[PDB]
Amino acid sequence: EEAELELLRQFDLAWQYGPCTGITRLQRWCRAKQMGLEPPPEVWQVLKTHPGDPRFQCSLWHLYPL
Amino acid sequence: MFEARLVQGSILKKVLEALKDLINEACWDISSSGVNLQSMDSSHVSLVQLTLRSEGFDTYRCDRNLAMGVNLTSMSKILKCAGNEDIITLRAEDNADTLALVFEAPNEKVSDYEMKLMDLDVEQLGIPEQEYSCVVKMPSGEFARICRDLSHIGDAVVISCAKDGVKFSASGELGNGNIKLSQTEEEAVTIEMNEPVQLTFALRYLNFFTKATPLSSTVTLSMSADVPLVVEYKIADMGHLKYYLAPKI
Amino acid sequence: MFEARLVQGSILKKVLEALKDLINEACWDISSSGVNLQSMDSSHVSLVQLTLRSEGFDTYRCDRNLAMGVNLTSMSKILKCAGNEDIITLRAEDNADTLALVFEAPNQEKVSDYEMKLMDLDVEQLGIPEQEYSCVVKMPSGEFARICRDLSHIGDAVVISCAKDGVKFSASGELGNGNIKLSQTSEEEAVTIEMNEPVQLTFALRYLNFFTKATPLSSTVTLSMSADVPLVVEYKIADMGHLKYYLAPKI
Amino acid sequence: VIQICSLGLRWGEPEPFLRLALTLRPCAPILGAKVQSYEKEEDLLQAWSTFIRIMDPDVITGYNIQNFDLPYLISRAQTLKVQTFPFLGRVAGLCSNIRDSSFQSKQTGRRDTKVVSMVGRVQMDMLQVLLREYKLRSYTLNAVSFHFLGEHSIITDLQNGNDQTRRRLAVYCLKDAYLPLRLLERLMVLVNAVEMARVTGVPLSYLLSRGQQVKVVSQLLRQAMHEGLLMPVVKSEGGEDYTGATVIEPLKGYYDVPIATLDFSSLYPSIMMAHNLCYTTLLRPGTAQKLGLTEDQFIRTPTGDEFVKTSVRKGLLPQILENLLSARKRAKAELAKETDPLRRQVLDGRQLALKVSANSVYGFTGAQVGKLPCLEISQSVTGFGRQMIEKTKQLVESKYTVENGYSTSAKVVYGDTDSVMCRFGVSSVAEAMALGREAADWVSGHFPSPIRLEFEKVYFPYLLISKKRYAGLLFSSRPDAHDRMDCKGLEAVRRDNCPLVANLVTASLRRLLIDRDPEGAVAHAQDVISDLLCNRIDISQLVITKELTRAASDYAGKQAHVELAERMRKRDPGSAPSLGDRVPYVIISAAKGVAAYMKSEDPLFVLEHSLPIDTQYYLEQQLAKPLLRIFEPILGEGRAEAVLLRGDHTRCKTVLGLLAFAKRRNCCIGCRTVLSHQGAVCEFCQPRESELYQKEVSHLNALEERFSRLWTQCQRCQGSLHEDVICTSRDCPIFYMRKKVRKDLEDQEQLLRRFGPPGPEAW
DNA sequence: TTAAGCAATTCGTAATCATGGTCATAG
DNA sequence: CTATGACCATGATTACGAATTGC
Ligand SMILES: Cc1cn([C@H]2C[C@H](O)[C@@H](COP(=O)(O)OP(=O)(O)OP(=O)(O)O)O2)c(=O)[nH]c1=O
Numbered sequence A: 001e002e003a004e005l006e007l008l009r010q011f012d013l014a015w016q017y018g019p020c021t022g023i024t025r026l027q028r029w030c031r032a033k034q035m036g037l038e039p040p041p042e043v044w045q046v047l048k049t050h051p052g053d054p055r056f057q058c059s060l061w062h063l064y065p066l
Numbered sequence B: 001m002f003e004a005r006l007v008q009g010s011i012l013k014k015v016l017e018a019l020k021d022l023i024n025e026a027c028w029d030i031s032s033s034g035v036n037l038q039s040m041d042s043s044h045v046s047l048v049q050l051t052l053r054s055e056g057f058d059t060y061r062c063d064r065n066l067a068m069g070v071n072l073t074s075m076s077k078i079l080k081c082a083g084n085e086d087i088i089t090l091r092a093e094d095n096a097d098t099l100a101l102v103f104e105a106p107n108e109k110v111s112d113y114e115m116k117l118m119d120l121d122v123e124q125l126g127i128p129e130q131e132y133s134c135v136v137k138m139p140s141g142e143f144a145r146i147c148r149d150l151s152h153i154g155d156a157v158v159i160s161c162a163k164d165g166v167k168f169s170a171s172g173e174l175g176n177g178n179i180k181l182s183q184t185e186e187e188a189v190t191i192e193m194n195e196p197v198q199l200t201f202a203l204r205y206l207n208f209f210t211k212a213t214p215l216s217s218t219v220t221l222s223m224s225a226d227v228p229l230v231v232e233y234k235i236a237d238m239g240h241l242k243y244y245l246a247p248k249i
Numbered sequence C: 001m002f003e004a005r006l007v008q009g010s011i012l013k014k015v016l017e018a019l020k021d022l023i024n025e026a027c028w029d030i031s032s033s034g035v036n037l038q039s040m041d042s043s044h045v046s047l048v049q050l051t052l053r054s055e056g057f058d059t060y061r062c063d064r065n066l067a068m069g070v071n072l073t074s075m076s077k078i079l080k081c082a083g084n085e086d087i088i089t090l091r092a093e094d095n096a097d098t099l100a101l102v103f104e105a106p107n108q109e110k111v112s113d114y115e116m117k118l119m120d121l122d123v124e125q126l127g128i129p130e131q132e133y134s135c136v137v138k139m140p141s142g143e144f145a146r147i148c149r150d151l152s153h154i155g156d157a158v159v160i161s162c163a164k165d166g167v168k169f170s171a172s173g174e175l176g177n178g179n180i181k182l183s184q185t186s187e188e189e190a191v192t193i194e195m196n197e198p199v200q201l202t203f204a205l206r207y208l209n210f211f212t213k214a215t216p217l218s219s220t221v222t223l224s225m226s227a228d229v230p231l232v233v234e235y236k237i238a239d240m241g242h243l244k245y246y247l248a249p250k251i
Numbered sequence D: 001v002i003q004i005c006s007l008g009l010r011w012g013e014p015e016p017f018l019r020l021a022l023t024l025r026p027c028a029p030i031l032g033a034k035v036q037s038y039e040k041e042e043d044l045l046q047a048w049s050t051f052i053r054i055m056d057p058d059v060i061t062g063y064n065i066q067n068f069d070l071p072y073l074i075s076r077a078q079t080l081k082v083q084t085f086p087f088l089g090r091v092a093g094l095c096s097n098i099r100d101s102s103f104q105s106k107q108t109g110r111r112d113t114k115v116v117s118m119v120g121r122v123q124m125d126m127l128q129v130l131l132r133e134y135k136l137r138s139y140t141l142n143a144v145s146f147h148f149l150g151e152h153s154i155i156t157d158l159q160n161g162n163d164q165t166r167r168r169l170a171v172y173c174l175k176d177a178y179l180p181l182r183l184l185e186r187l188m189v190l191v192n193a194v195e196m197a198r199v200t201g202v203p204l205s206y207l208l209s210r211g212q213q214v215k216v217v218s219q220l221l222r223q224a225m226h227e228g229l230l231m232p233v234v235k236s237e238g239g240e241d242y243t244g245a246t247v248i249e250p251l252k253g254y255y256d257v258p259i260a261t262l263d264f265s266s267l268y269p270s271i272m273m274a275h276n277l278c279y280t281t282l283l284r285p286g287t288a289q290k291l292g293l294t295e296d297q298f299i300r301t302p303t304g305d306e307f308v309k310t311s312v313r314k315g316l317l318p319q320i321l322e323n324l325l326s327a328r329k330r331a332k333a334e335l336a337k338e339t340d341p342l343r344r345q346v347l348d349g350r351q352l353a354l355k356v357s358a359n360s361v362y363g364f365t366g367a368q369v370g371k372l373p374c375l376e377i378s379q380s381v382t383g384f385g386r387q388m389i390e391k392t393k394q395l396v397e398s399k400y401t402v403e404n405g406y407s408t409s410a411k412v413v414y415g416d417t418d419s420v421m422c423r424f425g426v427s428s429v430a431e432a433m434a435l436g437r438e439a440a441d442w443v444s445g446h447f448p449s450p451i452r453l454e455f456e457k458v459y460f461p462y463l464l465i466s467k468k469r470y471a472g473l474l475f476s477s478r479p480d481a482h483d484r485m486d487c488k489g490l491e492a493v494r495r496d497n498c499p500l501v502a503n504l505v506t507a508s509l510r511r512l513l514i515d516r517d518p519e520g521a522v523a524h525a526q527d528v529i530s531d532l533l534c535n536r537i538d539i540s541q542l543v544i545t546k547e548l549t550r551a552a553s554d555y556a557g558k559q560a561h562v563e564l565a566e567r568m569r570k571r572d573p574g575s576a577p578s579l580g581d582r583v584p585y586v587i588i589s590a591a592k593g594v595a596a597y598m599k600s601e602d603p604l605f606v607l608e609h610s611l612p613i614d615t616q617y618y619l620e621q622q623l624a625k626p627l628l629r630i631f632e633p634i635l636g637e638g639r640a641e642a643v644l645l646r647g648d649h650t651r652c653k654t655v656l657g658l659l660a661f662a663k664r665r666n667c668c669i670g671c672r673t674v675l676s677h678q679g680a681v682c683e684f685c686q687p688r689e690s691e692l693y694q695k696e697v698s699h700l701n702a703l704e705e706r707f708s709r710l711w712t713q714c715q716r717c718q719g720s721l722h723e724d725v726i727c728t729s730r731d732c733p734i735f736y737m738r739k740k741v742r743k744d745l746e747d748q749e750q751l752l753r754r755f756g757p758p759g760p761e762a763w
Numbered sequence E: 001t002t003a004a005g006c007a008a009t010t011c012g013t014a015a016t017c018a019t020g021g022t023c024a025t026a027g
Numbered sequence F: 001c002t003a004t005g006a007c008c009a010t011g012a013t014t015a016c017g018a019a020t021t022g023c
């Protein structure tokens, strides 16, 4: 923790995985894996050792009335 | 077609003066089980729940489940054109949006009014039944004076239910004070306790809740952990009237 | 440690109801003689002397010559929260600058325990003269209030003529002149105009309305006047002591 | 400070020549601009100071650079210990400093600004130019860019990310830094500033700091050296007021026969010109005596003074006024040959400025707190004004009458201190125009020169409500049929109200004056009130704005906007309204009826926290009384009952801590009876179910069509079709109108799942 | 040391004044 | 157990300041 919260914030702004501020984080991870762009096997291995926490399993701007 | 007839119009006038300040619009759910109502206040803080059971109306007739939309100010103005001894009948169609009220004096004078209803798009809410753990049954006059007397000091009040009795405290810029009450027919204060309670509620809502004091002699206060305080009144072989208010955090 | 009780306690409600419209503050002098209050008015025309002996109380403990100050109208708003049959109890610590009021019930089931904070006071204090009052009148308080209020709807200030046979309450106004005459009546409803030498004086009728705020405060009202001196109206607080309102006269 | 972005041009060339952007992390290249990157902020501030020394610009502009940008840079350079930053000026050994200043007048109000010292260079914040010249509703860059052209915590994670995010941030910053240049060259700011400095004779820094006194002092001194006079110093605190202008009593109502308007042009400067009024020719009451020559040596005014004829002296204020009048005449002669509309109004702005200068010459005389007051002159001016307008009204109503061979005796309906609205009688616009031109040219021949009356318009029809409140339709020629409406004073040009009310007043006067159909007007006002009560009106139409003036007058009595401003937020005690700006608010519903200052809230706070709206406040306090102003004079008091009955058929249709403890009782779609079970239809109203499904799928169909038109408009206003939209612009109707249709669709989609599915889905 | 003028209409808040519903106690 | 006016409570009228626009 506090290092796992920057890896996800770095996965969320890389443009080669998609334009993602409307959906979940694991849905975008599996969308890129289907098309197989290059999802890395570390943004998966922190979404498995946690429960349904809203500060891991949510996009950066999931507040913010946009 | 709906038609009811009730001999004690005074009960109707007391219930309509319970609510004309807290609520401006309501929907009456007319059924074959009685006349039942739920509403929120205008401030979106408190809940009212009113039940007039079907038996206590001394001449009942309801064909089909209705829903009437009533502006409570115009109805409260109409029900003060009827003295305290009259006999009140309600007449409604199942195709119309206009209600008829006929007041029958117990002596040569009969009166009849027609009132236009309105269509409203409100949503109906309710309550689930759980066991509140502090159960107070107290005189209504003492509760009215206690709320009205603490009101001049400050605006919150803390209710403190302990073993032998309950204790109400309130503060403000001109100081603070409490009132005790202890276990010792209707002038008694019966106190059932399993877990002790201490909670805080604002006074403007309580001084709204104590407007319906002529409906009964005693009042029932129910408390539990972190739930909305319930204020309950009973109307004799007619039904009941409940207000609901949430605690401060 | 001051701790005092009063069973027929409606009198305190009654005095502070007739105190708060006059003045905004009071200099409460607690001595071993009891509870006293000398205080001027706000308009520099009048004065209140309240004396409450200890023998008019029930149960008493005074260990200090306390000299405190009360903001009156907030204390009256607190006194509005207790009935008249209810027992009034006061408690005071000579280091803790607060007043602890305890309202007991006659059925003892409702207990009240209120607290008002203190504020400092440097109030002026003058002594009344003692002299001969050429006219002392014993009157019913309700009839007196009725008469001066009946004069309030004519004009503003009253002229009084105090003599042997009758007494003459006259006034002018925007509708003209009027006057009512009284005489002695040959225990509470009895009147008496005890007189040596007849006089004429000017007084303010609005301050008579202010002074008749203590109408339910006694058996009889006493009206004491002489030449060019403060009128003292007296309400004898029954079995307790007395309240005297001084009004410096007009020119 | 993480990014600085700069644009530079030579004046006269239609594009810039320099485009630079300096960032603080490594970035990605932008076509058309240079990009440099640094790993520390000291290098960034040093690089900007060296660039600003080497390019050496004449003028520095921006938007809110005075009160935000330059003191932020100066304080940030002081904190990080960089010694060589604050030398931005032209003199080689001088450092710059922050200094407060205030300005106040009854014309622009009071404003408090900081200044930063730059010797040699000139500053033009475009915000201060807008706030001084223009009277608008919001003064944000988005609002004035829409009005003239047509358009913090997210940025901190666009900068802590990657370098294409930083490239997006730099393109945004460069568009921001480019907009005030376009506004400066499009609005003809600098050309008018240079012409103002050449006509008045004051420097170019005084037209951004001072008022209208230094210019008239300057022109009077420049005219005083040519005859050898010296000015005195009189100062007095304080004289009394004098009597201003007359207004003629109306004949109120609705007119449908044409009224022609005749007015005087440049009234007070021509009074001061053609009766030889000046400081330097004011005759004291004794110095006429004991000479007795009254005739053609002096004159007498209605207030009482005596003033010398022009055969002895020429005043100084006639000559200054004559120069200003010729400059404005040349500006109008240039304006009479433009075809573009925005260019036509900016030349109108130039001539408006020269007329304001000429009238402030007269207003200099009566200012008892000033530098040289002579209230005798002011009283003579307004006395001559009153005398001449009553002369106009007597003459116009007296000559053209039934006995004098004409058709109908005319009757004046209105006059306000420079104009006369005479009602002639004919209902043909050609004959009214002909007689009105004859009347203007006839009456003008009873005066000295340059006093002239002129025809200006014909109103047909006309609507007169009170003093300083009227409306009409505008005719310039006859075969030029009609131009527009005129709304003098009414509820459509003031800014103290809601957009909903001003829009309703404009649409009602449109349907009522152009098409002459009161039934569509009643149906329109009914639909507005019905859609108000049914809770389908956007919150853009509900926002009220008020100006936060000096704090002691707002200490004297409790207001709504002052209460909202002085109540800080928990989020930000560092961004709040200051003195001089505008506070926006809406009114929410509560039960504290003694105070409308206890129900006011920020629009963004009621957005994010979802508080309800007081529809009865907006119904009886905002809407109702302007409508009763407008709709009554065409009919009687059965018209008040007609609109209050058109309310009455439509008032009976209203839409609706403890809120979490819901039960969510279902209800019959046909007859609204709460009942156990989830089926949509009631057992008595079950047969008519195909019609009840038919009804409401044409509502889902129309919500679907509104979702798509809005959420793809943001993609075209943003620029890109492949990346996310981030624009929470509070001055755009687009924002928060795109937020509620998501919830309408969320609700209306779930109401139709009460009905089953129209087929399987797992086959 | 610094600042162009007057006329008029509209709306909100607190304070002043009128009037009825309870009530409290003397008959 | 029942008249009478004194007492509390709620609504109609006036006054004045603030804001903004027309000449
Ligand atoms: C607008 C305005 C008018 N006035 C006075 C002077 C003017 O002579 C008089 C007439 O007002 P305006 O008609 O507004 O101005 P104007 O007549 O001088 O010029 P034009 O007809 O070409 O528009 O009102 C002022 O003193 N100060 C002002 O700001």
Ligand code: SF4
Pocket (backbone or CB within 6 Å): D713, D714, D717, D718, D725, D727, D728, D729, D732, D733, D734, D735
């Ligand atoms: S909300 Fe959409 S349309 Fe409105 S300003 Fe923002 S991007 Fe443009």
Ligand SMILES: [Zn+2]
Pocket (backbone or CB within 6 Å): D668, D669, D670, D671, D672, D673, D681, D682, D683, D684, D685
């Ligand atoms: Zn049904």
